[PDB]
Amino acid sequence: GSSGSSGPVKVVVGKTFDAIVMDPKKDVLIEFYAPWCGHCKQLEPIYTSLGKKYKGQKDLVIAKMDATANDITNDQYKVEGFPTIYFAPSGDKKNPIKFEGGNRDLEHLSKFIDEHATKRSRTKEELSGPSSG
């Protein structure tokens, strides 16, 4: 349990990344934002609600980190363009899930979490997409 001082979205660092973002106790959604990017600005608010709202979920904590400052020791997590969201499922983290839909909003983002979520609601994963990556 961690309260939000200046926002609902939990902030993680390199020293608390492999501990939080890589917490096998619960699925943590890490979103690499850039303090020098515009897209992140329009998403700033979009993500805020996405967290404060998902705060009432099961073993789920929508956090974020500044890949620009913190170096992602991992290798599976790559930040080519911001914003960049990654869902780390408690257990199968080794395989990160980048939000790939087209429209980054509070309506689409939620549709990506509920699916890749900890199987909370009645929903399956039937996608005939690529494997590698």
Side-chain angles (χ1 to χ4, degrees), residues 74-91:
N74 287 319
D75 300 271
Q76 54 213 228
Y77 292 73
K78 269 267 87 62
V79 178
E80 289 182 35
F82 320 76
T84 315
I85 296 161
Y86 270 111
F87 190 113
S90 77

Side-chain angles (χ1 to χ4, degrees), residues 12-14 17 30-38 40 64-72 78-84:
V12 175
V13 298
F17 179 109
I30 188 61
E31 171 177 287
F32 305 118
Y33 68 86
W36 41 261
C37 181
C40 75
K64 64 178 158 70
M65 169 156 118
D66 316 43
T68 71
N70 290 278
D71 309 273
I72 307 165
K78 269 267 87 62
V79 178
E80 289 182 35
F82 320 76
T84 315

Side-chain angles (χ1 to χ4, degrees), residues 23-81:
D23 204 35
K25 298 207 155 283
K26 55 157 92 281
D27 313 35
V28 176
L29 185 78
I30 188 61
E31 171 177 287
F32 305 118
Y33 68 86
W36 41 261
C37 181
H39 303 150
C40 75
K41 300 208 206 197
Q42 93 195 302
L43 176 76
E44 268 307 322
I46 294 160
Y47 209 54
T48 299
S49 288
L50 188 75
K52 89 193 279 276
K53 82 194 299 295
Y54 270 78
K55 273 270 172 183
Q57 270 296 88
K58 277 284 285 273
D59 336 75
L60 186 89
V61 177
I62 289 184
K64 64 178 158 70
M65 169 156 118
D66 316 43
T68 71
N70 290 278
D71 309 273
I72 307 165
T73 51
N74 287 319
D75 300 271
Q76 54 213 228
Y77 292 73
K78 269 267 87 62
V79 178
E80 289 182 35

Side-chain angles (χ1 to χ4, degrees), residues 66-118:
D66 316 43
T68 71
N70 290 278
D71 309 273
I72 307 165
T73 51
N74 287 319
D75 300 271
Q76 54 213 228
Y77 292 73
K78 269 267 87 62
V79 178
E80 289 182 35
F82 320 76
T84 315
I85 296 161
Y86 270 111
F87 190 113
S90 77
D92 193 86
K93 313 203 163 295
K94 279 292 195 79
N95 277 304
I97 308 161
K98 173 153 165 163
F99 165 63
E100 287 272 291
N103 296 340
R104 208 150 281 201
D105 34 284
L106 187 90
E107 273 157 323
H108 270 213
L109 286 172
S110 59
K111 277 189 296 184
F112 161 87
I113 300 165
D114 166 76
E115 271 81 310
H116 279 300
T118 197

